[PDB]
Every structure is written in structure tokens, then in C-alpha cells.
Design an enzyme around this catalytic site. Structure first.
Site, PDB file in Angstrom:
ATOM      1  CE  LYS A 143      45.902  -3.450  32.274  1.00 32.86           C
ATOM      2  NZ  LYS A 143      46.854  -4.590  32.697  1.00 32.86           N
ATOM      3  NE  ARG A 184      39.847 -11.136  32.839  1.00 34.59           N
ATOM      4  CZ  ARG A 184      39.146 -10.499  31.885  1.00 34.59           C
ATOM      5  NH1 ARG A 184      39.684 -10.279  30.697  1.00 34.59           N
ATOM      6  NH2 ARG A 184      37.899 -10.073  32.083  1.00 34.59           N
ATOM      7  CD  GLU A 190      49.703  -3.495  34.007  1.00 37.91           C
ATOM      8  OE1 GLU A 190      48.935  -3.345  33.034  1.00 37.91           O
ATOM      9  OE2 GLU A 190      50.476  -4.459  34.077  1.00 37.91           O
ATOM     10  CD  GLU A 238      45.835  -9.708  36.401  1.00 33.74           C
ATOM     11  OE1 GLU A 238      44.810 -10.172  35.811  1.00 33.74           O
ATOM     12  OE2 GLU A 238      46.789  -9.129  35.799  1.00 33.74           O
ATOM     13  CD  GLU A 264      36.801  -2.496  39.482  1.00 32.73           C
ATOM     14  OE1 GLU A 264      37.118  -3.454  38.708  1.00 32.73           O
ATOM     15  OE2 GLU A 264      35.613  -2.130  39.688  1.00 32.73           O
TER      16      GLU A 264
END
Ligand SMILES: Nc1ncnc2c1ncn2[C@@H]1O[C@H](COP(=O)(O)O)[C@@H](O)[C@H]1O
Length: 645
Positions: A307, A312, A459, A360, A305
Site C-alpha cells: 500500500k 490515486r 503503510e 498511485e 501488494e
DNA sequence: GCTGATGCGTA
DNA sequence: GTCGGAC
DNA sequence: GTCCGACTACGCATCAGC
């Protein structure tokens, strides 16, 4: 006498070896002495034994005092979702220490910076601990209430009141108490024992010496019958009950009084994961390359996945329609996001009656339909926002489902929970979408995906197994996910060559040497070194020592005329600009403080480094030969997230 | 009330 | 957030 | 591998001194 107390004593006996009569209040000096023994040793097993020994006595004699003793040892003020904070900084604490002892401030501030510990300074000064006859001893529950007292006071003129309370303790302190009050207030207890080791000590302590027992307790060591092997296995399975419970309800306020009247075996029955009650999230282990993934995962199938770089948001939807939201620290973030409560309707199917989502929150520009950087997300108000105000829109990127329609999805594999998430939830582009995932084991595909995430304002990659050891049972292994970050990879990454222009005195583990440094880039056009960022991780203990000796030669009374730090923290030692260090970072940011490259990308703001770390010395390079503010402006402009503006 | 210093939560 | 140490 | 404690930037919210 409590000063004699030894909870580290061989073959330790709860009732005989205590230092308070039963149904009395636990004395704070007991807690301080347990602390002295814990910091004296370096093995976590020994530390756990000592804290267990105190906790067992506390259960046999003064069980109401259990909750505060545990809080005192974590250095916590209460449940994380209630939001307490002391609101006392080092400077206030130093005024408090100085007045209490009778000393000049400057003198105190000096010795505290020198020893790297306020606790040591508060201990070894005892004037007016003379004239006034000693106050009554300090109690564990009493000290923990005075802490909650300080954290409670707010508004105009509260500092003065916060100080009086602290002076209260310092005057009642005797022996080694002032050391640990001062450490606790400064939020630097440094025992070498923290959350994981507290839980270990708790579950061992009630296992060996169970609560709810008619005094004098019938059984004080339920471990004696067993052989040494049978013990260790029973201890381990006891600790896991507690750990997975705590992991679902990290709240001593709930968990503890339940333990005192139902024993440890019955805890999972009364305290189960439940909407509106935040739970410890799942964490990522850093992985320095695709090769290391297949080492860590071997034969298990896994997924990859995106990032995302936001924060969060653990979204809670209870039966009855109410909606709450929590940070990864269990902070209540519900009031922070009116916009997300309004848009709960739009994300589920009508058949969905309750959920906990793992997502997120990422800043989103709707004008342009793409991701804004982390610095943008953080300009949103906290506290109590009312929906009219919202400036920075957030978009949700969901990637896990923890609890659905009344049932707890913890023990289920990820493959399962992701399906359930994909079945019962609804992507609305730019508002609530799913995590870009690629299921694969082909190393080429994984690398193309990595470079793709960074191209798409992320990232790097998260990496999670699908079926083998792929649950959400944090107590088994908290760092059960992998993070494949772009900057983890040797040869790939922003590394800059920077000049050490300043040093800061270390604290704690770094007392006596330098704990951090001030770094600058070279600006050719104004013939000036300009501060870019501080540096404090990446060196070994030896390297950090070499740096203390080699850079002490160059301490200067004042800064070179050509050094420019503007807003940054004035170093403790100015240094003759000579030393050049290689420095790696994850991103570059627009700074409110640093002058490096000001005016080259923003008329007002300079550029800094995000997550800087020391790599090695550039012995072959000179301050002139350093990365230039010009180059710092080039590096900034080419940032994937930045080019998308 | 205005302003500068700074705690603290987020990464 | 990243990173190193003691076990 | 696990746990712990050194350290990083940034910006909102808060309070003291005037
Ligand atoms: N696909 C994803 N899965 C899990 N966490 C993610 C994902 N994308 C972003 N994150 C965030 O990355 C954090 C972990 O990063 P670290 O540096 O430990 C989590 O706490 C999430 O907020």
C-alpha cells in the site's frame, strides 16, 4: 396544496397523490416534504420507498425535472469531473441567514452553534416575511439553478453576490424549505440517505413506473402482477443494471436523459466504460489482522501488494493519443501533472492503443532514489501547472488495468488483468513501476512482507483475491479489497497519552453534546501543555456522553496560563487540564499549526498526529504523567519514512 | 498590492 | 482518512 | 456486511479588508 404532500403514504399513487399538475414544474416544497419523511425514519428500505414515490410522480408528470430532483437529493451540483463548488462557508451562510431574517449576527451564530444545525435557525425566523407579500413559490429546478448560480460566481466581490442569491431563497421559502436550503448550502443535508439509496430509489422508480409513456401513463405500477417474491427479485436485478452502469459512468448528465428515452433495460448499451470518462474506483475494507484475511477470503487464492502513501491517479489513454488523469473523486487532475503526460510514451509497448490504469502517484526524490512522505506530495501546485515549474517529482506505482486496446477488462479476474498489465507495460525505475506483490498463503511470509513494506516507506499491505469474486465490478461490492495497515494491530502502534485541554460543540448527530476535543502533550522544559491535535472519532455514543457530563464540571472561562495552542482552533469550552486519554494514530506529521514539540525537529514547525482516534480513558494518570513533547519528538524521528531521510 | 482568514480536495 | 450505529 | 454521517491533518488557491 403541497404542504399536505405525503410521499410516505400507504399504497402511494403517482398521479393522484402528487401535488402538481402534469407538465408543470415540480415544486420545491414537494422536495422538502419528501425530505421531512426521509429524515423522520431510520430504515434505509423505508427511505428508499419514499424517495422512489416522489421520483415516480416526477417521471409521470415532469420528466425534465428528474435530473435536478436527483441532484437536490444527493446534494450535488453536477458531474464530479466538472469541478463545481459553492464557495460558501458557515460564516457567510450565517450572514446570509441573519440578514434574510432580520436578526443580529451574534444572536444567529449563537443559536446555530447551540442547535448544531443552521437549517433549524433559518426556518424559525420570518420577519419581512411580513411586509412584502409572498414571492412566487420555489421550484425544484429553480432552486437547483440558483445553487449552480452561487457556485459559478468568482473573483473580487463575489461573496456579496453569493449572499444576495441565498437571501433570495430565504425570502421565497415557506414551511420547511428554509431548513433544507440552509442545510444544503452548508453541505450537511443529513437525511440518512445518500448515493447508494438514491440509485436504489431511481431504479425502483423507473421500474415501477417506466418513462417515455404517453400521458396519462398506461402502466403506473409494473409490480402489481407479480407475487411478493417475484417482485423483490425483479427490483434487485433492475437496481444492478443501474448500479453497474453508474459505476462505469457516474454522471447523471449522461445517464439520465438516456434513461428517459430508452428505458432502463437499454442503458448498458449507450453508456459503457470509455476512456476520458472517469469511473468509480475499487475500495478497501479495513482488516484488523492476518487472521481476519483468511476469515474473509477462506479458500480463494489472493495476492498481497504494498500500500503506497501518495494519491490515486486513474490514468486514461484514448485512441488518438490524448491523455487524461482523474482523482479517486472523479476530479480532473490532468492539468495537475504535465510530467506524467510527457512520460506516457515510456510506459507502454508500441502495440498498446488505449488503456485505463489504476495507479498511485507518489512523491519521489531522484537525488536519493526513494519515497518522500505524503506532506511532500501535497506541496505540488494544482490547477494548471506548466512543466517547467514541477518541483516534487512523482513516480507511478501501477496495480490494476481496467481497459485495454478498445476492450473493457471489468468482468475479467484480477489474475487476468494483472497479467495484461505485466505483458503490455514497461517498468522504468523511479518513474512508472509495478506494485510489489507476493502471491502466497503462508502466514509467516505474509507477516514478513507486512513488516517489509513499512520498512520500504509504505503503510502496510493491500489484499486482493485472484479468481474468486476478483473482478472490478464495483456494483457487486465496492469494498472488495482488504487493507492490512500496520496501525490496525493491537499492541503494534504509536499510542500516546494526551491531556484534554479544550472542547468543541457538536453538530448534527452530535448536537447537544461535544463533537470534538483539543489535546495536548506535556513539555517539561517550559512547564507548558502544548496542543498536538484535535480528536473526534473512536468513542461510542455512551462514552461520548460520559465525556460531556464529566468534562462540563471543568469548563473554564479562560485558559490556564500554562496552556499553549498557538495556531490551533480556539476551543469553544476551555477545560481545566485534568483528563488523560489514550490516543492512537497512523503517522506523525510536521505541523504548520500545532506547537507540540516545536523546535525539537524543525526550528519553526511543531508536530501533529495523522488520523488520531480515541482508545480509552487513562483514569490512573495525571497531566504530569502524559506523553511529553520530548517523547513526541522521539516518536517522530523513528518513523520509517523519516529515517530514510 | 499585502496579509490573514478560510474553502476544499487530497489522505 | 478512522470509527460507531441502525438495519 | 452495507450504507451513512459524525469527526481528523495539511497546503494550494481564493477573496475581503485595508
Ligand atoms: N497496491 C495497491 N492497490 C490498491 N490501492 C493502493 C495500493 N497502494 C496504494 N493504494 C492506495 O490506497 C487507497 C486505499 O486506501 P484506503 O485507506 O481506503 C487507494 O485508493 C490507492 O490510492
Amino acid at each position: 396544496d403541497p404542504s399536505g404532500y405525503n410521499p410516505a403514504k400507504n399504497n402511494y399513487h403517482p398521479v393522484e397523490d402528487a401535488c402538481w399538475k402534469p407538465g408543470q414544474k415540480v415544486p420545491y416544497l414537494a422536495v422538502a416534504r419528501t425530505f421531512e419523511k426521509i429524515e423522520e425514519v431510520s430504515a434505509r428500505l423505508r427511505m428508499v420507498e419514499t424517495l422512489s414515490n416522489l421520483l415516480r410522480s416526477v417521471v409521470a408528470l415532469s420528466p425534465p425535472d428528474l435530473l435536478p430532483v436527483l441532484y437536490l437529493s444527493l446534494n450535488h451540483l453536477g458531474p464530479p469531473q466538472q469541478g463545481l463548488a459553492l464557495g460558501v462557508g458557515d460564516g457567510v451562510l450565517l450572514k446570509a441567514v441573519a440578514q434574510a431574517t432580520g436578526r443580529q449576527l451574534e444572536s444567529v451564530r449563537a443559536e446555530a452553534a447551540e442547535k448544531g444545525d443552521v437549517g433549524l435557525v433559518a426556518e424559525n425566523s420570518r420577519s419581512t416575511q411580513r411586509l412584502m407579500l409572498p414571492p412566487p413559490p420555489l421550484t425544484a429546478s429553480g432552486v437547483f439553478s440558483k445553487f449552480r448560480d452561487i457556485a459559478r460566481l468568482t473573483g473580487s466581490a463575489s461573496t456579496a453576490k453569493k449572499i444576495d442569491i441565498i437571501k433570495g431563497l430565504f425570502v421565497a421559502c415557506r414551511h420547511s424549505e428554509a431548513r433544507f436550503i440552509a442545510r444544503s448550502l452548508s453541505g450537511r443535508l443529513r437525511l440518512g440517505l445518500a448515493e447508494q439509496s438514491v440509485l436504489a430509489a431511481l431504479s425502483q422508480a423507473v421500474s415501477l413506473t417506466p418513462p417515455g409513456q404517453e400521458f396519462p401513463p398506461a402502466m403506473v405500477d409494473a409490480g402489481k402482477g407479480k407475487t411478493a417474491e417475484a417482485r423483490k427479485t425483479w427490483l434487485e436485478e433492475q437496481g444492478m443494471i443501474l448500479k453497474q452502469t453508474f459505476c462505469e459512468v457516474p454522471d447523471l448528465d449522461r445517464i439520465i436523459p438516456v434513461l428517459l428515452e430508452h428505458g432502463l433495460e437499454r442503458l448498458p448499451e449507450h453508456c459503457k466504460l470509455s476512456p476520458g470518462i472517469p469511473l468509480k474506483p475499487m475500495l478497501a475494507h479495513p482488516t484488523r489482522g492476518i487472521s481476519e484475511v483468511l476469515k474473509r477470503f477462506e479458500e480463494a487464492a489472493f495476492t498481497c501488494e504494498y500500500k503506497y502513501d501518495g494519491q490515486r491517479a486513474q490514468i486514461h489513454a484514448l485512441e488518438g493519443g490524448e491523455v487524461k488523469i482523474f482523482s479517486r473523486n472523479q476530479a480532473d487532475n490532468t492539468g495537475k501533472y504535465p510530467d506524467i503526460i510527457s512520460r506516457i510514451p515510456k510506459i507502454k509497448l508500441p502495440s498498446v492503443t488505449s488503456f485505463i490504469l489504476d495507479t498511485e502517484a507518489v512523491a519521489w526524490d531522484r537525488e536519493k532514489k526513494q519515497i518522500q512522505p505524503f506532506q511532500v506530495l501535497t506541496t505540488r501546485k494544482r490547477k494548471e501547472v506548466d512543466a517547467s515549474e514541477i518541483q516534487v517529482q512523482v513516480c507511478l506505482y501501477a496495480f490494476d488495468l481496467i481497459y485495454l486496446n478498445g476492450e473493457s477488462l471489468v468482468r475479467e479476474p484480477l489474475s487476468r488483468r494483472r497479467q495484461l498489465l505485466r505483458e503490455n507495460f514497461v517498468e522504468t525505475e523511479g518513474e512508472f513501476v509495478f506494485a510489489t506483490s507476493l502471491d502466497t498463503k503462508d502466514i509467516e511470509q505474509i507477516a514478513e512482507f507486512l513488516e517489509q513494506s513499512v520498512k520500504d516507506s509504505c503503510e502496510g499491505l493491500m489484499v486482493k483475491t485472484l479468481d474468486v469474486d476478483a473482478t472490478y465490478e464495483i456494483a457487486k461490492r465496492s469494498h472488495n479489497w482488504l487493507k492490512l495497515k500496520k496501525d490496525y494491530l493491537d499492541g503494534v502502534g504509536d499510542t500516546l497519552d494526551l491531556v484534554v485541554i479544550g472542547a468543541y460543540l457538536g453538530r448534527g448527530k452530535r448536537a447537544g453534546r461535544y463533537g470534538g476535543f483539543l489535546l495536548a502533550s506535556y513539555d517539561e522544559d517550559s512547564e507548558e501543555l502544548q496542543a498536538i491535535c484535535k480528536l473526534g472519532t473512536g468513542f461510542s455514543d455512551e462514552e461520548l456522553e460520559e465525556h460531556h457530563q464529566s468534562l462540563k464540571a471543568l469548563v473554564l472561562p479562560s485558559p490556564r496560563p500554562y496552556v499553549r495552542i498557538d495556531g490551533a482552533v480556539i476551543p469553544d469550552h476551555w477545560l481545566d487540564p485534568s483528563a488523560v486519554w489514550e490516543v492512537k494514530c497512523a503517522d506523525l506529521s510536521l505541523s504548520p499549526i500545532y506547537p507540540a514539540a516545536r523546535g525539537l525537529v524543525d526550528s519553526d514547525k511543531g508536530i501533529s498526529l495523522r488520523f488520531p482516534r480515541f482508545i480509552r480513558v487513562r483514569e490512573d494518570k495525571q497531566p504530569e504523567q502524559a506523553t511529553t513533547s520530548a517523547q513526541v519528538a522521539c516518536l517522530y524521528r523513528k518513523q520509517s519514512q523519516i529515517q530514510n531521510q
